[PDB]
Symmetry: D2
Subunit: 317 residues, 4 copies
C-alpha cells in the first residue's frame, strides 16, 4: 500500500504523541511547496503573454502566509527579509522556521534546477519571541529538508529518526514516499565545486582537487559536476554520493552560503543520512549563530570523502 506525505506526517505525529501543532506546520509547508512548484513550472504563463481577458517574491509570500496560517509558528527567518518576522500573537505557535523560499534564483532564466530549503527550531527561551530565538545551533533542529524543482519535484524531509524522500505526483497533488530511511554511500566518485575560483582556494582544497583529478594510486579520477544550484548539487550528493564544497576564498572570506537557511538544513539532512558536514575546522551544526544572515564555509557529502579532505586540512595546520 502507498504512503503519502500527509499520512506519514500524521502517523509520525501520532507516534510522537504531539499535540498536532508540528503536524499542521508540516502540512502547511507541503501545501506551500506544491504551490511554488506550480508557479516554477510556469502554469498560467500564457496569461502574462496576452491570451487576453517575481518568482522569489511570490515564493516568499507563499511560504510566509501559509506558515502563519498554520498557527504553529512564532518566528520566521527568510533569506529574502533583512529582519526576522515575528508572528502576531493571535497566530503564534511554538515553532521558528528558517527558510530560503527559492534557492538558485539567478538560475531561473536558464531553467536550471532550483529549490526551497527549510529548518525548524522549537522556541526554547519562552520570552517575547524574537530574532535571538532563531540563533540556535543547527544541532537544535527538530526538522529540516528541501523541495527540489528539477526534472520532477521532490521533498526531502529529515527528522530525528531519519531521512525520507517524497516525489510529487502533480496529477493528484500528493507527495508519495519513494525512498525510505535514506543513507548516503560511504565513498563517492564525484566532487562538486566551482573551480573558477581556483586562484583563491586555500592549500587544503587545492591539494584535494588535484588528488581527485590525478589520484596518487593510479585509480580513476572523480567525475566533476557543478550545477550551481545548492539544492540540486546537494541532492545529487545525497542520492548518488560524493562531496560538495563551497569553501572560503577572497570574495567570500567566510563562504557565500548562509548558515541558518542553507547550511544548517543541508548539514542536518546529511548527518541523518550518515554523511558529514564540516566548515573545514568544525561541524556546521555545532556553530552558534550570532547573526541570522550569517555565512559559513561548507563541505558535505560521503563520510570518507569529507574525512579525507579533513585529514588534509589538519595536515596544513
Amino acid at each position: 500500500n502507498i504512503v503519502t506525505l500527509t499520512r506519514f506526517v500524521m502517523e509520525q505525529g501520532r507516534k510522537a504523541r504531539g499535540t498536532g501543532e508540528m503536524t499542521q506546520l508540516l502540512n502547511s509547508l507541503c501545501t506551500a511547496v506544491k504551490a511554488i512548484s506550480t508557479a516554477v513550472r510556469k502554469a498560467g504563463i500564457a496569461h502574462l503573454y496576452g491570451i487576453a481577458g517575481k518568482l522569489d517574491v511570490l515564493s516568499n509570500d507563499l511560504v510566509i502566509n501559509v506558515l502563519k496560517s498554520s498557527f504553529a509558528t512564532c518566528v520566521l527567518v527568510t533569506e529574502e527579509d533583512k529582519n526576522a518576522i515575528i508572528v502576531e500573537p493571535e497566530k503564534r505557535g511554538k515553532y521558528v522556521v528558517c527558510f530560503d523560499p527559492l534557492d538558485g534564483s539567478s538560475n531561473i532564466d536558464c531553467l536550471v534546477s532550483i529549490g526551497t530549503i527549510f529548518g525548524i527550531y522549537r522556541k526554547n527561551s519562552t520570552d517575547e519571541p524574537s530574532e535571538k530565538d532563531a540563533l540556535q545551533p543547527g544541532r537544535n533542529l527538530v526538522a529540516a529538508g528541501y523541495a527540489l524543482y528539477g526534472s520532477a519535484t521532490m521533498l526531502v524531509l529529515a527528522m530525528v529518526n531519519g531521512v525520507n524522500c517524497f516525489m510529487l505526483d502533480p496529477a493528484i497533488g500528493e507527495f508519495i514516499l519513494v525512498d525510505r530511511n535514506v543513507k548516503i554511500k560511504k565513498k563517492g566518485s564525484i566532487y562538486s565545486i566551482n573551480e573558477g575560483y581556483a586562484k583563491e582556494f586555500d592549500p587544503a582544497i587545492t591539494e584535494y582537487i588535484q588528488r581527485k583529478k590525478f589520484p596518487p594510486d593510479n585509480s580513476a579520477p572523480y567525475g566533476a559536476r557543478y550545477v550551481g544550484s545548492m539544492v540540486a548539487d546537494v541532492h545529487r550528493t545525497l542520492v548518488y554520493g560524493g562531496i560538495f564544497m563551497y569553501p572560503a576564498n577572497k570574495k567570500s572570506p567566510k563562504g557565500k552560503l548562509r548558515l541558518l537557511y542553507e547550511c544548517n538544513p543541508m548539514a542536518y539532512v546529511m548527518e541523518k543520512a550518515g554523511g558529514l558536514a564540516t566548515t573545514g575546522k568544525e561541524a556546521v551544526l555545532d556553530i552558534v549563530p550570532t547573526d541570522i544572515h550569517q555565512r559559513a564555509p561548507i563541505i558535505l557529502g560521503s563520510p570518507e570523502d569529507v574525512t579525507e579532505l579533513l585529514e588534509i586540512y589538519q595536515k596544513h595546520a
Copy 2:
C-alpha cells in the same frame, strides 16, 4: 496577441509555400515533447506505487509513433536504436529525423534537467530510403532544436531564419513564444567542461582552462558550471553566454557526444544564434558522417570564447 508554437509553425509553413508536410511534422514533434515532459515530471506515479492496487524507452516509443503518425518522415535515427528506422511506405513522407529522445538519462535518478534533441533533414535523392539518407553533414539540416525539461519545459527551434524559444504552459498544454530570434553573447563569463578528465586533456584545452582560472591580463576569472546534461549545459550557454566543451580523451579519442543527434542539432542552433561549434579542427556542421552513431568532439558557445581556444589549438598545431 500571443504566439503559440502551433500558430508560428503554420504561418512559417504558409510564408514558405510548403505543402504542409513539414508543418505536420513539427506539430507531431510538439505533441511528443508535451507527452514526454508529462512523464518526466512524474504525473501518475501514484499508480506505480499502488494507489489502486523505462522513461528512456517510453520516450523513444512516443517520438517514434508520433513521428510515424505524421506521414512526413521516411527515415528515423534514434540514439536508442542500433539501426535506423525505415518508415512503412504507407506512412512514408520525405523527412529524415535524427533524435535523442531523452538525453541525460543517467541523471533521471538525481532529478537533474534532461532533454530531447532532434535534427531534421530533407531526403535528398530518389532511391529507397535507408540509413544512408541520414548520413548528411549537419550543414544540410532543414530544422533542428531541443526541448529542456528543467524547472520549466522549453522548446528551442532553429530554422534558416533563426532561433526561437517557446515556453510550455502545462495548464493549457501550449508552447508560447517567449524569446524571438535569439543571438548568443559575443563573449561570456562561464566555461563548462568536466574537469574530472584533466589528466586526459590535450595541451590546448589544458592551457585554455588555465587562462580562465588565472587570466594572464589580470581580468576576472570565469565562473565554472557543468550540470552534466548537454541540453542543460548548452541551453545555459545559449541564453547566458560562454563556452561548453566535450573534447576527446581516453573515453574514446573520438569524443563522447554523438554527431547526428547530439552535436549537429546543437551546432546548428548555435550557428543560427551567432555562435560557433567546432571539434577544435573543423566546424561540426561540415563533418560528413560515416556512421549514424559516430561520436565527435565539440566545443560551442560565444564566438569570441570559441575563437580564443581555436587560437590555442593553432599555437599547438
Copy 3:
C-alpha cells in the same frame, strides 16, 4: 488567510480531541477523491489512444485501497460489492464506511456530472466486525458527504457541527474551503423528478407536481431540472434550493436509490443544512437497515417544499 481541507480536518480533530484515527480516514478519502477526479477528467486518455510506448471498477479499487491503508476502518460497504468488506485485523480501525464510488455511471458516456457518496459510522457493538455493523440508521452517522465531478470538482462534508464545501484547485491538488456552514433556503423554486414515470406515481406526488406547474394562487410555477445524476441534482438543491424526488413507483416499489450509500449520506447532509429528507411516510435517517443494498424512497430539499408535499401525503391517508 486560506483554509484547506487538510488544515480544517486536522483542526477539527484537535478540537474534538480525537486520537487522529478519523483524521487519517478523512485524509485518505480526500486523496481518493482527487485521484478519481483526475481519472474522470480523462488524464492520460491519449495512452488508450495509442500515443504508443472501467471507470467505476477503478474508482472502486481506489476507494477500497486508500481507505484500507488509512488503518482507520473495519467494514466497507460499496455499491459495487455484493457483500460487506471486512478489513484484515492488521489494518483494522474503528470505522465503517458505506460508499458509492461513482454515482451516475450510465451518464459517463454523455459527460454528465457524476460523483462519489460516502457515509461513515463508528463500529459500536465490539464483536468480530461484520455486515451487521453497517446496518445502522443514518441518524448514527459520524460524518457524510460527497464529491461532485461537474464543471469543477467539489467535496461537501457534513459532520455534527455543520456542512462545508471545498473546491478542488487542480493546479496544486488542494481543496479550498469555499462555503462555510451551509444552510439551504427555506423555500425553493425548482422541483426535480423524472416525470417519465408519471403513469406510475402515487396520488400525492401527482398532486404535488400539478401544484408546481399550475399553482392555485396564480404565482410563478417552479422551474424543472433533472440531470439524472443524484449527486448533481442534490448538489443544486442544497446550493440553490428546491426539492428533489425519487418516490416509489412500479419498476421500483421501494424506490431505486439505495439507503446506506445514497439516501443516508444525502439525508444527513440535508438535515445538517436545515433541510428535510423523508420517505413520504418517515424520516430517512431513522430507518433501521436490514440489508446493506436496501432501497428506499426519497424526497429531500428545502423544509417548506418538503413539508408541503408531506401535508399532501397525510391528506391521502
Copy 4:
C-alpha cells in the same frame, strides 16, 4: 496511430486545398477552448482565496483575442456583446464567427456542465465587413460545433463531411479524436424539456409530452432529462438519442434560445449527424436572421421523434 485535433484540422485543410486561413482559425479555437476549460475547472482558485496574500467575461475575452490573433476573421458576434465586433483591418481575415463563450453561466454556481458554442460563416460579399455579414441563414455555415465542460471536456466539430468528437486530455493539452463521423439514433427514449412551463405550452407540445408519459400504443414511456444547459442537453441527445425542446411560451412568444450562436450551430451539428432541428414550422437552418440577438424556438434530436411531433404540429395546424 492517434489523431489529435491539430493533426485532423491540418489534413482536412490540405485535402480541401485551403490557403490555411481556416486552419489557423480552427487552431485558435482549440487553444481558446483549452484555456476556458482550465478556468472552468478552477485551476488557481487558491490564489483568489489568499494562498499568497467574471468567468463569463474571461471566456469572452479569451475567445475574442485568440480569434483576432488568428488573422482569419473579420466579424465576431458574441452573446455577451450588444454589437458585433468588427476586426481591425490589420488582422482582418475572411471569416465571420458567431459564438456563445460560456453557455449555462447561471449554472456555474451549482457546478452544472457548461459549454462554448460557435458557428463559422465565410464572408460572402465584398464591401466593408459589418453586422450584416453575420446575418446569414445557418444553411450557409462553413463549420459549427461546441465544447462541453462536463465530467470531461469534449469538442464536437461539424463540417460538410460530418461530425467528429475530440476528448481533451488535460495532461498533455491535446484533443484526441474519439468518435468519428457520428450519426444520431433514428429513435430515442428520452425527451428533454422544462415542464415547469406546462401552463404555457401550445397544444402540440402538450399532446406530445402526454404521448411520451402515457403511450397510446401501450409501449414503454420515455425517460425524462433536463440538465438546464443546452450544450449538455444537446450533447446527451446527439450521443444517446431522443429529443430536446425549447418551444415558445410567455418567456417570449419567440423562444429563449438565440439563433446565431445557440440554435444554428446545434441545428447544423444535428443535421450533419442525421437528425432534425425545427421551430415546429420551419427548419432552423433556413430561417433568414434579421437580428444578431434574434431568438428562435427549436426542437432537435432523432429524426423519428422530431417527425412525430411535427405531425402533431400538423394536426393542430
